[PDB]
Every structure is written in C-alpha cells, then in structure tokens.
Design a protein around this ligand. Structure first.
Ligand SMILES: [Cl-]
Ligand SMILES: [Cl-]
Length: 162
C-alpha cells in the first residue's frame, strides 16, 4: 500500500463530472472542480484543467494526471505550512500517508485547525490523538473514511485498508 492506492480507495474514480459528499462538482479521483453550483462553471474549470474541450468527461489517463498533480500539491502544501511540516517530519511513513489523506480531503487550512490532535500526533500519543480527532465535523460527516484514516494514525499500519 502507498498514498496513491490509499486515496484511490477513499475517493474512487469517476470519469464524468459528479458531486462530492458536500455537493460540489468534482471529477476523477477526488479532483474538486469548483464550489460553485453552476455546472457550466464546472465544465469551464474542467476544460481549463485538462487543456481541451471535454464536455464533462475525461479519460482514465487524464484522471490519473490530475491525481498525480493533486498528491504532489498536497505534499508540497504540507511542507510549506509551518504548522504542518513539523508534524509531518516527526512521523513514520505510514502515518505520514494519513496526514496527506486529510490534507487532500480538507485542505491545509482545515487540517491545520486540528491543533490539539496535531500536537498529540507530534508527541506520539496515538490513542489520545485518535479520540480527539473523532470530535470533529469531518468524523461525523464521513465517518467510514475518517475511521480508516484515524486507525492509520493510531496503529501506523495499513490494516484499515486491507
Ligand atoms: Cl464533535
Ligand atoms: Cl466516509
């Protein structure tokens, strides 16, 4: 298991524009296109992302390209954020993947708001971190996914994805 496979499991793969859990236009492997309720807008942003007139549909290849860009961007975002970096560098490989997942889902800012859990993770207080993180809108809104990521932080293993 790696970051790609993990996110591919949590986000799925859809070749046509669809709405995510929050109702936002998305495509591919969890690639948010726009928060706007306008489908046209979504179509616009998609073409601009791909570089061609897609008419709301892309190929697998194209979905994977977006995914590579998105993961790269997520990691780079972590390293550039003064609140996230230290945490990330303190972790082992597996747990780092859990942190990337959260950032991919919620954005850096969103993750950066988990102050207390981040501190706990930095202190390697696994269980405490797991219980604090569950007290969130994130956990209540997408609990199965959140449970998988939380378990990952908790154990440092991929058991939740097997
Ligand atoms: Cl809560
Ligand atoms: Cl979920």
């Amino acid at each position: 298991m790696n970051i790609f496979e993990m996110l591919r499991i949590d986000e799925g793969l859809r070749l046509k524009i669809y709405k995510d859990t929050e109702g936002y236009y998305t495509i591919g492997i969890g690639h948010l296109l726009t928060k706007s309720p306008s489908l046209n807008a979504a179509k616009s942003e998609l073409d601009k992302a791909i570089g061609r007139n897609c008419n709301g549909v892309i190929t697998k290849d194209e979905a994977e390209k977006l995914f590579n860009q998105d993961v790269d961007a997520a990691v780079r975002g972590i390293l550039r954020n003064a609140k996230l970096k230290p945490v990330y560098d303190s972790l082992d490989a597996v747990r780092r993947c859990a942190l990337i997942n959260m950032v991919f889902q919620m954005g850096e800012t969103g993750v950066a708001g988990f102050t207390n859990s981040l501190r706990m993770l930095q202190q390697k207080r696994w269980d405490e971190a797991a219980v604090n993180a569950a007290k969130s809108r994130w956990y209540n809104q997408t609990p199965n996914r959140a449970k998988r990521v939380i378990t990952t932080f908790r154990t440092g293993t991929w058991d939740a994805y097997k």
